[PDB]
């Protein structure tokens, strides 16, 4: 079994969830109507989790407050409306999904097939020492990975690092930012170890964004696995990843060509509104992100 699309939860909750909780509070629909609009606001804002359990807590709360409004309160028939709603379930907590929006240089989105569901964790990097330590200086621009690395993630990181170092001299020899400077890099934890390497395709694009210093094109999530010579490799668990990217409002996505199969198994309504760009050799991705 898989997760659930944002719209999909609406058709679930109006039938298989709302009446059940209505039987938990013992009311009938005659006195405690809940429009669709309340449901779409709920699931779109207040609960971003692949499971339906969280929405189940919310709708419970709303119902039980309605029960209090009936047996002692004023109304004999509570009528929730979105303007009413903030009374019952309080003020909105989350709204601004995907924290950065301008994405200042050297931060890139990256999908991750976490232990439960999928989440659009960002990857970030930055300088850790003055860059022009010596105009003649010849010291390796040592990286420092951080973010609860497993050692396997460490080799993946070093591989991606070396490919970045090679790609620059292959592209723009005059720049030397990477080999001549220290760099801290941070991968947020959450990915299960087996997919750990899958973040790597993001990594190289992070570094390159820092190198020229130009920002990545907005909301272009990506994933992959880098080969130390620009080949990309298949990743696993695609259906969860695609739904997580859907929740965050992503409007483009890039996958290894080897998974052009599995992504098409998905139900057609799930895939509407995305614009995929399958690719195999890494150079391709460089032309679908920056320019």
């Amino acid at each position: 079994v898989s997760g659930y699309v944002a719209q999909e939860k609406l058709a679930i909750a109006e039938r298989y969830l709302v009446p059940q909780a209505r039987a938990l509070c013992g009311l009938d629909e005659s006195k405690a109507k809940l429009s669709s609009d309340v449901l779409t606001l709920l699931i779109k804002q207040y609960c971003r989790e692949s499971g339906v359990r969280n929405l189940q807590k919310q709708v419970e709360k709303v119902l039980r407050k309605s029960a209090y409004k009936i047996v002692s309160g004023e109304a004999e028939s509570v009528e929730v409306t979105p303007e009413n709603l903030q009374d019952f379930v309080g003020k909105p907590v989350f709204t601004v999904e995907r924290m950065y929006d301008v994405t200042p240089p050297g931060v890139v989105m990256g999908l991750a097939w976490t232990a439960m569901g999928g989440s659009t964790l960002f990857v970030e990097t930055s300088l850790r020492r003055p860059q022009d330590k010596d105009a003649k200086g010849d010291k390796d621009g040592s990286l420092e990975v951080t973010g609860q690395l497993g050692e396997v993630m460490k080799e993946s990181a070093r591989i991606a690092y070396t490919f970045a170092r090679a790609f620059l001299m292959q592209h723009a020899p005059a720049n030397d930012y990477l080999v001549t400077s220290h760099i801290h890099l941070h991968v947020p934890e959450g990915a299960t170890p087996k997919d750990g390497p899958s973040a790597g395709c993001t990594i190289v694009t992070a570094l390159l964004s820092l190198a020229m210093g130009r920002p990545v094109r907005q909301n272009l999530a990506m994933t992959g696995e880098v080969s130390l010579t620009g080949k990309i490799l298949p990743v696993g668990g695609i259906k969860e990843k695609t739904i997580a990217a859907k929740r965050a409002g992503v409007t483009c996505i890039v996958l290894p060509a080897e998974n052009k199969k599995d992504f098409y198994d998905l139900a057609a309504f799930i895939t509407e509104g995305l614009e995929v760009h399958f690719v195999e050799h890494y150079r391709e991705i460089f032309d679908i992100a920056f320019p």
Binding site: K57, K65, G73
Partner: protein, 243 residues
Amino acid sequence: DAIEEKFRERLKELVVPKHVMDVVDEELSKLGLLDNHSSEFNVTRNYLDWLTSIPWGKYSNENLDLARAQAVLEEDHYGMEDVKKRILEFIAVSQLRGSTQGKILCFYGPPGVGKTSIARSIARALNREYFRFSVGGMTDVAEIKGHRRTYVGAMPGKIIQCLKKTKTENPLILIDEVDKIGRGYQGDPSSALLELLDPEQNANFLDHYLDVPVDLSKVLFICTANVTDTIPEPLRDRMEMIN
């Protein structure tokens, strides 16, 4: 059958579930099989004490007017209208949709804000019995679920004792300091608590010491944690986090 008879006139007063009635009937049959002087007779006679002591159907009645809750909270706690309005909505909604209803709740803030004090104040508001139960840093499962009752020195988990002490079937338990519960490999009590806190499975809770299912459904549990973030997600996601 002296102990059997005092506990049996007891049995006649408190309305035990018929299932637990027959289960104590077969267990009493074994007690008849068991010797008058055996040390296991002492363990199982004090088992009969722990089991018969538990109220089975004693039901403290609540007040249900919000007004008396107004006063009694005002009798012992000034201001903080947000938490009072929350409890007021809580009673107001449970009062609407017929029967009593469960929900778990937490209060959190700097120590000594009156958390436990409002707990007891609510306990005497609703008229439910009070019982504190700290769980900060606890690890062993023998204090929560109990022992097997076949271990030397075995005793039932803390809950059996709260029921033994409070004498109502529907008290206001107050677990304390949930946030720092010891979640280890040695049998995690914090995972074990889910059987307590499951809205449906609390109704047929059972523990290794006294096998017989208990029926906690009427209890109004309360839990107190200083910060909401450290609590593990499966436990944290059910209950409302008042501040």
